[PDB]
RNA sequence: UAUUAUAUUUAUUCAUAUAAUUAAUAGGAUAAUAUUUGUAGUUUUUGAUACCAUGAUAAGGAUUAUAAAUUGAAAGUGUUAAUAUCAUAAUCAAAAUUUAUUAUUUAUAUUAAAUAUGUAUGUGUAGAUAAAAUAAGAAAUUA
């Protein structure tokens, strides 16, 4: 009939009920979109770097410049680990992403010792690799930091230009089951009603949401259900 | 309202002995409707004119099962004595029906030929205390 | 249904609802009737054209025609019920107890007045008021003047 | 105070409080609000155009000599807007026996064409003939250098997809870069049909092909007609054109993917009488297209739904 | 335990779609998850529902002319319905048939719009008198 | 004690309520083209109800007086906001008097448009009661 899970409870096993309509902070009910299939920065967990990221650069842009190089176009290798790299990009120089935030603090001539290449100017195009993408945005962020009027990023970079398939940190999609309680400091208390309410933080969490949603065939999709159909635990309305 | 006779009883205050405008009261009762005059036989609550027609509760308008009662408005013809027929009005406590078919009652509204308030009370639909007052005013006998 | 998570208050605020319905429905009918009504009743001949027997006939026939036409809405507005679109309290208009230009019950003005709510000006309770019109003839007087600058003012073509 | 909240406006003790405006002050406007100007959202109706020609615009160029002097035999033809039922045979018949005695090029394709697209609306099946009778020397035959006036192309092209005919893969390819570069002056509707006749025939690979060039060509998807796009993805059930088409589906809009779902689910559905010729049953493609809608849409929070389950972890 | 209003309902659309739609999670309206609409009722119901809520003229108030019970009870008083073949004897029967519900399109502003004198209002709208279609 | 008057006038036959389903959005001529013409995913909840289920505005003269000035008051009279765990009761006409709380037409001429009251002539006649010092016209027995 009715049951914990069905009926209206402020509080479950002494925490916050995350099924009732009113636990939750307003703001959740807003609308967003998916992310998890764009590319890893742009996603809503990164959303404290988003000021910073680059413009970016495709793989015509590159295949170009290789046939047709720019004097003062530089193209920036940043492939951190040695073991890992054996091939040249046409034109690059190489500054591995872990020196980075020195570099950019040497002079001239300083920089011009420790590298072997002249320091861009910083009105000069930058484009910037690596084996994924992800550590030439890091170090994105870095050059734009001090500032540098145009980086480019070349997402997908190492790996498409010469097929390999290497990553620069071994990050997965996958989040890890959430352990603990729900954290206290996702928990807003309400300023008129003094009422505490849960946020989308933690165990409640939009990634978790994307993570589990129904994969997109519906052979595979299939396959993830009992015979009968996709949700038999609950009552027919809440399915 | 003191004593529900119907659902309205929830609803409604009386509001003590209150004054409305001319001729609107909220609820039409008409204990007058039947008013014997002579004179007046043909004008006194009917059709202003003898030109026009009968209303529309006179005719079957539409695809029928049946009715229960007829209208209180509808007009008495030379057919609801002739025919035979069952002829009833929703009258309280439940219905009246006209068994006795007589050709004095043509030609006026039944309005006019059902006595709304009966000089027969009944003496189980009154409270002790209701029954005591009707004794005062000299109508029960005690 | 059935008093089954029922999401106001009052049920009964779904009448003013219904009555609405009404208004509509008389404006749908209106004409209709009223052109029937005055076809039908009319005993002088109806014109130059149409007299005689055409005319006794064409009378019965529309009179018939108007008999033939089920839930079209005949009932005067006096005898329309007025009910409150915020509590569902009634009163009788044209009485103390039904407030016309909000169309609001007694209570309703009551509540809503003195929790300001709806604007107005206090005016000395035992007069006829600021106004010129009332001060002259009182209600019927102002009644009057509002006939004759909604319609009197025009010389119609 | 209640369970009926005030409203704003006609309340005073709203409007004339310490967090609005009192009446006693002086009323005037605030600050100004340009919203139209800075920022400004083009047209586009719930309801379809009312007026729009909804058909394939064969573009009748005749020279006003001809125009006259072949008046009783173009009058059976269809003019613009205007479509009268003269028997397909007969208008053939006509063709056949006049032309030859008219001297121009330009004059003959253009008169063809108009026999084309009366056959069309008919759907009567033996006018390709007439293809390879006149105009397949010339233009599609051995690598001939001639390019065949453009409404002639659109004309029997919109034959082929009014009658289905495997002839139109021919056709079209000569329209691309290399050949006669006609491709980007074809009609958004010219698109819808031909996508809806090779759904119905079910080539992937087609559906493949003609997307491919829509795309490259600019041409309006949105307004391509969701029918149509919906029975050229219903015929897909190849692997590799699979793939293609999920990708692919990213180039329509936020609504115009919702009514791909809506559409898809009415013609296996309740509207599955609104086909000439019923859908055939793509599972796959039809779950593909509802998951593609509900990835792109708003999301929605529902938490008795997500958390149904959730049971909280002291570890 | 359990206390319905109605004892069975209806899916408003049908298998082909459903079946499939079904693997794809739906965002029912967070308050109040469960809809059961009047596309959902049943034909039996929907008649009955349909019937009452017109005020006396619609069928379903015993005394319109259209009841199919053969009895109602006012006050613990059993009334037997007259038949209509009777009710006919002294009460004339003038019909015209629906022809008389419909005036022409000429008269539509005359009538604020409508071309139905029916008891319900009838929008010409797709949604307002909607089923499920 | 000075800053000033109740002992006048007119009234009192007082009635009116009924025929159950409150749960969501959706744009069209003179717009650069969407059939989105015809937008179709039943089923896990329970209070304002006929029913216990707090709040809030009435009526009710008794001593701040005359000048350039109001004879109506907060102590609360059905409908309104946190206690729920028997029930669809709501006017769209034409309807059934028991309810303290209501100024009706009284003798020349008397029912025409929504249908509109048939009853009580009795020596202005018991007991008991009502109203007023305000554009009216009243004058002498405070705590
Ligand atoms: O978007 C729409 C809406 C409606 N229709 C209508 O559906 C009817 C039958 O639906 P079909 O779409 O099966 O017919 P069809 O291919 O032969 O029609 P054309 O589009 O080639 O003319 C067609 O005759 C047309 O009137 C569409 O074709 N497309
Ligand atoms: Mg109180
Ligand atoms: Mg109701």
Redesign the interface.
């Known amino acids: 009939?009715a049951d914990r899970?069905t009926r209206h409870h402020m509080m479950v096993?002494?925490?916050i009920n995350?099924?009732?309509?009113?636990?939750?902070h307003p703001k959740?009910?807003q609308?967003?979109?998916?992310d998890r299939?764009k590319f890893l920065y742009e996603q809503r967990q990164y959303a404290q770097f988003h000021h910073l990221l680059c413009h970016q650069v495709y793989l015509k842009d590159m295949l170009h410049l290789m046939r047709y190089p720019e004097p003062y176009t530089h193209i920036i290798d940043c492939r951190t680990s040695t073991q890992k790299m054996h091939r040249w990009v046409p034109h690059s120089l190489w500054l591995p992403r872990d020196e980075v935030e020195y570099a950019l603090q040497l002079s001239a001539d300083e920089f011009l010792d420790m590298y072997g290449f002249r320091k861009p100017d910083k009105s000069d195009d930058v484009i910037l690799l690596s084996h994924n993408g992800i550590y030439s945005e890091q170090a994105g962020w870095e050059w734009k930091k001090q500032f540098f009027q145009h980086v480019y990023n070349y997402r997908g970079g190492t790996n498409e230009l010469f097929g390999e398939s290497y990553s620069d940190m071994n990050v997965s999609d996958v989040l890890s089951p959430w352990?603990?309680?729900?954290p206290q400091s996702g928990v807003f208390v309400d300023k008129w009603s003094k009422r505490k309410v849960l946020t989308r933080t933690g165990?409640?969490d939009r990634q978790y949401?994307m993570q589990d949603?129904?994969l997109?065939?519906?052979?595979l999709?299939?396959a993830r259900?009992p015979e009968e159909?996709?949700?038999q635990?609950?009552?027919?309305?809440?399915? | 309202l003191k004593i529900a006779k119907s659902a309205f009883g929830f609803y409604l205050a009386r509001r003590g002995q209150r004054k409305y405008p001319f001729l609107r009261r909220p609820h039409i009762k008409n204990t007058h409707s039947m008013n014997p005059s002579a004179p007046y036989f043909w004008s006194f609550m009917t059709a202003k004119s003898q030109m026009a027609f009968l209303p529309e509760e006179n005719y079957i308008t539409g695809d029928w099962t049946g009715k229960f009662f007829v209208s209180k408005r509808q007009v008495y013809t030379l057919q609801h004595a002739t025919s035979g027929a069952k002829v009833r009005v929703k009258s309280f406590p439940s219905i009246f029906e006209f068994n006795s078919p007589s050709r004095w009652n043509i030609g006026k509204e039944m309005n006019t030929l059902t006595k709304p308030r009966m000089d027969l009370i009944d003496e189980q639909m009154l409270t002790k205390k209701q029954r005591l007052d009707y004794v005062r005013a000299g109508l029960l006998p005690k | 249904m059935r008093h089954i998570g029922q999401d106001v208050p009052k049920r009964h605020t779904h009448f003013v609802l219904e009555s609405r319905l009404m208004y509509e429905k008389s404006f749908r009918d209106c004409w209709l009737h009223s052109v029937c009504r005055a076809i039908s009743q009319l005993d002088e001949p109806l014109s130059k054209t149409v007299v005689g027997t055409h005319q006794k006939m064409l009378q019965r026939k529309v009179t018939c025609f108007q008999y033939n036409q089920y839930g079209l809405f005949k009932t005067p507005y006096y005898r329309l019920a007025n009910v409150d679109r915020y509590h569902a309290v009634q009163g009788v208009a044209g009485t103390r107890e039904w407030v016309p230009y909000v169309n609001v019950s007694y209570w309703t003005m009551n509540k809503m007045v003195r929790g300001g709510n709806l604007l107005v000006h206090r005016v000395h309770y035992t007069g006829w008021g600021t106004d010129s019109h009332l001060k002259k003839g009182g209600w019927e007087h102002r009644w009057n003047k509002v006939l004759q600058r909604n319609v009197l003012q025009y010389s119609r073509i | 105070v209640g369970y009926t909240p005030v409203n704003p406006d006609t309340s005073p003790m709203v409007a004339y409080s310490q967090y609005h405006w009192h009446y006693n002050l002086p009323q005037g406007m605030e600050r100004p609000h340009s919203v139209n100007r800075t920022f400004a959202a083009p047209f586009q109706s719930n309801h379809s155009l009312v007026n729009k020609y909804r058909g394939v615009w064969i573009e009748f160029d005749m020279h006003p000599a001809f125009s006259v002097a072949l008046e009783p035999q173009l009058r059976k033809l269809p003019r613009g807007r205007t479509l009268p039922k003269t028997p397909a045979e007969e208008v053939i018949a006509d063709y056949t026996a006049l032309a030859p005695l008219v001297d121009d090029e330009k004059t003959r394709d253009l008169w063809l064409a108009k026999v084309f697209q009366h056959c069309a609306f008919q759907r009567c099946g033996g006018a390709m003939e007439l293809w390879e009778r006149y105009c397949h020397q010339r233009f599609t035959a051995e690598g001939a250098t001639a390019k065949p006036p453009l409404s002639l192309v659109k004309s029997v092209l919109f034959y082929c997809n009014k009658t289905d005919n495997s002839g139109w893969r021919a056709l079209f390819d000569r329209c691309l870069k290399d050949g006669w570069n006609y491709t980007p002056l074809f009609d958004t509707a010219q698109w819808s049909f031909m996508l809806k006749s090779i759904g119905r025939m079910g080539d992937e690979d087609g559906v493949r092909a003609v997307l491919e060039e829509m795309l490259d060509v600019q041409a309006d998807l949105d307004r391509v007609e969701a029918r149509s796009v919906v029975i050229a993805l219903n015929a897909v059930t190849n692997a590799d054109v699979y793939e293609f088409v999920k990708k692919y589906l990213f180039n329509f809009g936020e609504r115009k993917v919702k009514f791909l779902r809506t559409t898809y689910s009415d013609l296996r559905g309740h509207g599955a009488g609104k086909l000439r010729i019923p859908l055939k049953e793509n599972d796959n493609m039809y779950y593909h297209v509802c998951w593609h809608s509900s990835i792109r849409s708003p999301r929605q929070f529902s938490p008795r739904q997500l958390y149904f389950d959730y049971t909280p972890s002291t570890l | 335990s359990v206390s319905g209003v109605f004892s069975k309902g209806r899916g408003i659309g049908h298998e082909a779609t459903t079946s499939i739609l079904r693997y794809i999670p739906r965002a029912r309206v967070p308050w109040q998850p469960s809809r059961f609409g009047r596309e959902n009722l049943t034909a039996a119901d929907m008649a009955r529902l349909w019937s009452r809520g017109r005020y006396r003229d619609g069928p379903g108030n015993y005394n319109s002319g259209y009841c199919t019970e053969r009895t109602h009870v006012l006050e613990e008083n059993t009334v037997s319905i007259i038949p209509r073949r009777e009710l006919e004897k002294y009460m004339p029967d003038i019909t015209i048939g629906p022809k008389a519900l419909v005036t022409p399109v000429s008269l539509m502003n005359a009538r604020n719009g409508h071309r139905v004198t029916h008891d319900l209002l009838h929008s010409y709208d797709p949604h307002i008198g909607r089923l499920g279609k």
Not at chain 1, 31 to 34: I, L, N, V
């Open positions: 009939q899970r096993d002494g925490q995350p099924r009732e309509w009113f636990n939750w959740e009910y609308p967003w979109y998916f299939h352990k603990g309680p729900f165990p409640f949401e949603f129904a997109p065939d519906l052979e999709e299939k259900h159909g996709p949700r635990n609950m009552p027919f309305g809440l399915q």
